[PDB]
Amino acid sequence: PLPATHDIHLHGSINGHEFDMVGGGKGDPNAGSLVTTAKSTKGALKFSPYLMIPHLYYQYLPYPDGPSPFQVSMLEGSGYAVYRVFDFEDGGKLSTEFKYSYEGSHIKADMKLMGSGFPDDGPVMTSQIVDQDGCVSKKTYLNNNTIVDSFDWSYNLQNGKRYRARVSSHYIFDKPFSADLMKKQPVFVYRKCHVKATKTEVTLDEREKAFYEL
Amino acid sequence: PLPATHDIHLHGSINGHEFDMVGGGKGDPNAGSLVTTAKSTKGALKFSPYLMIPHLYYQYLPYPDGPSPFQVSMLEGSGYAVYRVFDFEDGGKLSTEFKYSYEGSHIKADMKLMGSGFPDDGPVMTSQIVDQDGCVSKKTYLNNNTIVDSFDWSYNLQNGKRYRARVSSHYIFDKPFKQPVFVYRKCHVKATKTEVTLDEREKAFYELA
Amino acid sequence: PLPATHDIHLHGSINGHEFDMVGGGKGDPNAGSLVTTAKSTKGALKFSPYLMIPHLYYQYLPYPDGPSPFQVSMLEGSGYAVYRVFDFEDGGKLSTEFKYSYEGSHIKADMKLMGSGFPDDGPVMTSQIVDQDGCVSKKTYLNNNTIVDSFDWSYNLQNGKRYRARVSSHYIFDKPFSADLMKKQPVFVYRKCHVKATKTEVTLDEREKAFYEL
Amino acid sequence: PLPATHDIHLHGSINGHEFDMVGGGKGDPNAGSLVTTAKSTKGALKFSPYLMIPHLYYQYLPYPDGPSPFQVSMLEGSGYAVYRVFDFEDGGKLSTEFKYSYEGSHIKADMKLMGSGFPDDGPVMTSQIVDQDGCVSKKTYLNNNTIVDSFDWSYNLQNGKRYRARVSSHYIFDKPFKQPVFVYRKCHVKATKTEVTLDEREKAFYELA
Numbered sequence: 112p113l114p115a116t117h118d119i120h121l122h123g124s125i126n127g128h129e130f131d132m133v134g135g136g137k138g139d140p141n142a143g144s145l146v147t148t149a150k151s152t153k154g155a156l157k158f159s160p161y162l163m164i165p166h167l168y169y170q171y172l173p174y175p176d177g178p179s180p181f182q183v184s185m186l187e188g189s190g191y192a193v194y195r196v197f198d199f200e201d202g203g204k205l206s207t208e209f210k211y212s213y214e215g216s217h218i219k220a221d222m223k224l225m226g227s228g229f230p231d232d233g234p235v236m237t238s239q240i241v242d243q244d245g246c247v248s249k250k251t252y253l254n255n256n257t258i259v260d261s262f263d264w265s266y267n268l269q270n271g272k273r274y275r276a277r278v279s280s281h282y283i284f285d286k287p288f289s290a291d292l293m294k295k296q297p298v299f300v301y302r303k304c305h306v307k308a309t310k311t312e313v314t315l316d317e318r319e320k321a322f323y324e325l
Numbered sequence: 326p327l328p329a330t331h332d333i334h335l336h337g338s339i340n341g342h343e344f345d346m347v348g349g350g351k352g353d354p355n356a357g358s359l360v361t362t363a364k365s366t367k368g369a370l371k372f373s374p375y376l377m378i379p380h381l382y383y384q385y386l387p388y389p390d391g392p393s394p395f396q397v398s399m400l401e402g403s404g405y406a407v408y409r410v411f412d413f414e415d416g417g418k419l420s421t422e423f424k425y426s427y428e429g430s431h432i433k434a435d436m437k438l439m440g441s442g443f444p445d446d447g448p449v450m451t452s453q454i455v456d457q458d459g460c461v462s463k464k465t466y467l468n469n470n471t472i473v474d475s476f477d478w479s480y481n482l483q484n485g486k487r488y489r490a491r492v493s494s495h496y497i498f499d500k501p502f503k504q505p506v507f508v509y510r511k512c513h514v515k516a517t518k519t520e521v522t523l524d525e526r527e528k529a530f531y532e533l534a
Numbered sequence: 535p536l537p538a539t540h541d542i543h544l545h546g547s548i549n550g551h552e553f554d555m556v557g558g559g560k561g562d563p564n565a566g567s568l569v570t571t572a573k574s575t576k577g578a579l580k581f582s583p584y585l586m587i588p589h590l591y592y593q594y595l596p597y598p599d600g601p602s603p604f605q606v607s608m609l610e611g612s613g614y615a616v617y618r619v620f621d622f623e624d625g626g627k628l629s630t631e632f633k634y635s636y637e638g639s640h641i642k643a644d645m646k647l648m649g650s651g652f653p654d655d656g657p658v659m660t661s662q663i664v665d666q667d668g669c670v671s672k673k674t675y676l677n678n679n680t681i682v683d684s685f686d687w688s689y690n691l692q693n694g695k696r697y698r699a700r701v702s703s704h705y706i707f708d709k710p711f712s713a714d715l716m717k718k719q720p721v722f723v724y725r726k727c728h729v730k731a732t733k734t735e736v737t738l739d740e741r742e743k744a745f746y747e748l
Numbered sequence: 749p750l751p752a753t754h755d756i757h758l759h760g761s762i763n764g765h766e767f768d769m770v771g772g773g774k775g776d777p778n779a780g781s782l783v784t785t786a787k788s789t790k791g792a793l794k795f796s797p798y799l800m801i802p803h804l805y806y807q808y809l810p811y812p813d814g815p816s817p818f819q820v821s822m823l824e825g826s827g828y829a830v831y832r833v834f835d836f837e838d839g840g841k842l843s844t845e846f847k848y849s850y851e852g853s854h855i856k857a858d859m860k861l862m863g864s865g866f867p868d869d870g871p872v873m874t875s876q877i878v879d880q881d882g883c884v885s886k887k888t889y890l891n892n893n894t895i896v897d898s899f900d901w902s903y904n905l906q907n908g909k910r911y912r913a914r915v916s917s918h919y920i921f922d923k924p925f926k927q928p929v930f931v932y933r934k935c936h937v938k939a940t941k942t943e944v945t946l947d948e949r950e951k952a953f954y955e956l957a
Contacts, residue, residue, distance in 0.1 A: 127679075127680075127706035144534075192550060196619055196621070201837065202676070202682065206619060206648065208648055225629065225631055227617040227680075227704035227706060228617075228702070228704045230676065230677065244504075245505065245507075245531075247461050251458075251479070253653065254654045255654075257549075257550075257651070261477050263463055263475050265465070265505070273465065277491075279625075279627055279651070281650035281651045297459065299459075299509070301530075302534070318534035324459050325509040325530065340894075341829065341893070341894075341922075406764065408841070408843075410835075410841050414625075416623075416890070416896065418833050418916055420831075420843035439845060441831045441894070441918035442890060442894065442896055442916070442918045444890065445891045468763075468867065470764070471763075493835075493839075493865070495841065495864035497763065497864060499764075567957075667888075668928065668955050670886065670930050674902070674910065684900050686886055686898050688888070688928070720882065720902070724955065724956040725957070741957035742957055745932075745956065746882075747882050747932065748932040748951040
């Protein structure tokens with residue numbers, strides 16, 4: 112079935128310091144929306160809690176003409192993994208790996224994040240981030256079981272400026288895609304992240320809308 | 326007034342070889358659509374004619390809730406210049422400069438393109454390009470008179486693969502002035518080694534969710 | 535003491551397929567040279583064995599005016615971790631994390647590599663790589679305990695062409711650097727990798743020479 | 749013959765504002781060193797004078813085992829053009845074009861620089877730059893008449909930080925022709941808002957180990 116609820120476990124290190132967060136949420140796979148809450152298990156985070164965004168489930172994402180490949184993967188009892196690399200404008204780098212397990216309509220996500228190079232006086236380490244702009248991702252097919260995308264992410268800072276990152280994503284599926292499915296590309300997805308956070312807990316309310324053309 | 330017709334002059338060099346094209350077209354500033362035809366004045370192009378895409382007028386682009394800054398600029402009798410840098414996946418680089426002059430609803434565009442580093446056996450120099458994917462650009466404001474954007478451009482090749490370029494655009498206005506502003510565009514092209522025609526469609530949006 | 539011998543354990547996944555290699559080698563910390571041999575523990579590698587290069591120990595690297603920060607770290611009983619991101623020209627991405635432990639002059643290295651987006655018909659997955667060009671890395675200081683570098687890596691292919699990657703490195707130390715040490719930058723390092731490999735075993739003979747100016 | 753003296757003319761625009769500088773200098777083609785002085789012809793520059801660095805002649809550059817291709821080109825009465833793209837960490841972009849003419853051992857250089865997207869409060873527009881780090885460029889060959897290079901440029905700021913740019917260079921020769929070839933360079937600069945002087949040192953190498 113399509114997902115209804117999920118658990119999340121984020122862990123790894125940022126600038127050489129380990130962090131760990133656990134939580135979960137729920138979503139509407141018909142609307143492409145979801146909510147996720149994560150709480151630290153090692154006390155206050157040493158970096159902006161917003162760095163955990165957009166990391167806080169494309170299994171909730173439908174396409175204009177039916178379930179997305181991500182949803183079909185879950186429905187058919189298959190699976191996929193997610194790999195991303197964030198190249199921040201000030202030298203910071205963040206690499207991520209997401210793995211999932213399914214139990215009925217409940218998803219369990221294990222997310223490993225490794226970040227480094229964030230200036231100690233930068234927006235991340237000094238928690239200057241206050242929001243993030245809506246964003247459009249571009250998805251295309253690579254090989255026969257991989258979807259690749261790119262997006263230019265931008266956080267909003269207290270001073271009104273923006274903090275940017277060039278992002279690349281690779282979604283690797285355990286089962287190959289059909290020939291007709293691969294004819295439908297690129298696929299664009301507009302997403303907006305509404306966040307509420309503290310030094311120990313972060314909550315994301317994500318909205319998504321995919322389109323082939325406008 | 327808003328634009329209705331335009332003429333174009335593209336010139337410069339690709340891999341050290343000069344090229345020159347002239348032509349024009351028209352468009353619908355209420356729909357964001359336009360057509361442009363350019364013909365070489367120096368014989369057959371030595372590189373893929375598709376390299377002239379998307380270079381073949383945002384004055385035809387309306388925004389989600391009214392005229393775009395590009396249109397407002399023209400309506401008020403002001404202007405802007407366009408600068409882009411295309412970073413191709415195989416090392417090729419393309420720098421462009423667009424300047425305009427207006428006469429009523431007619432636009433005259435001068436476009437200078439300087440490209441280098443394209444492998445002689447690559448898709449550009451061996452004309453492997455056959456089409457280009459629809460594309461979404463992300464626009465934000467900088468300083469008091471500049472709009473900046475980025476987009477990941479991708480051509481479709483004869484062999485079924487794609488040929489990508491990371492693109493940056495800077496629109497500098499002559500006078501000081503909701504973001505980001507996204508724009509979906511699709512280019513429909515018909516080309517030969519001496520003439521290229523573009524039918525462009527555009528649709529801007531602030532948000533879809 | 536300075537290192538004399540080392541063990542290596544590389545593991546992770548490339549394009550969604552797990553791999554694991556173990557081995558080790560020795561080096562000359564006075565010359566900046568070293569040799570490392572790694573052998574697969576899961577049979578033949580599904581990707582070019584050269585992808586394991588340059589991953590196969592800056593503790594062997596001296597500077598023109600004395601032991602490098604990497605060597606001093608080991609000598610003083612401290613330590614550092616290494617994080618890299620390889621951005622390949624054809625979309626491939628490789629993120630790495632190296633951690634070390636020391637026992638006298640013997641180093642134990644645990645290397646985690648996560649790669650994705652390599653085209654199935656590309657030089658990596660079809661093993662077209664036959665060598666790699668000499669390379670110069672540029673090192674500068676960030677914060678008070680991090681060294682950052684960049685280098686433009688290039689493999690040589692059978693057809694005579696090259697396969698490039700833009701690389702970023704972050705070396706995070708457990709102890710902060712002195713003020714005078716940080717005045718000495720950038721530091722450049724020329725390195726050449728001499729490799730011999732098979733689908734199951736790879737051997738690297740690395741040469742290095744650092745300089746502040748020429 | 750190898751070069752001994754040169755004149756320079758830099759022009760173009762930065763963030764939509766035109767600039768123009770003229771001057772010249774000399775160098776030692778056996779040592780790879782040279783000096784260049786350029787003075788503004790349009791009053792004080794509106795951006796950091798250091799932005800004119802490293803733009804202020806590889807004809808003075810020898811290689812590890814003999815004259816460089818840049819020198820061979822000049823000696824044989826041929827020539828080459830230089831195209832660079834600077835991708836600055838804060839969004840600024842700079843595209844450059846250098847063309848030369850020779851008269852014996854004297855070189856005349858025409859340099860066009862087009863820059864945009866520099867934040868008005870950034871290090872370039874507020875003149876925060878005070879120096880630049882030594883730098884190593886990596887050169888490789890492409891096609892039959894091009895040399896391509898890359899280098900990670902870094903300016904030093906008044907506040908102690910660095911301001912970086914990812915740079916790509918394409919040297920296109922008029923006629924067809926050991927790699928990579930690395931070149932360490934250091935720029936010693938003295939500048940004011942109207943005049944900039946560069947003392948450049950260069951040393952190429954194929955390998956050091």
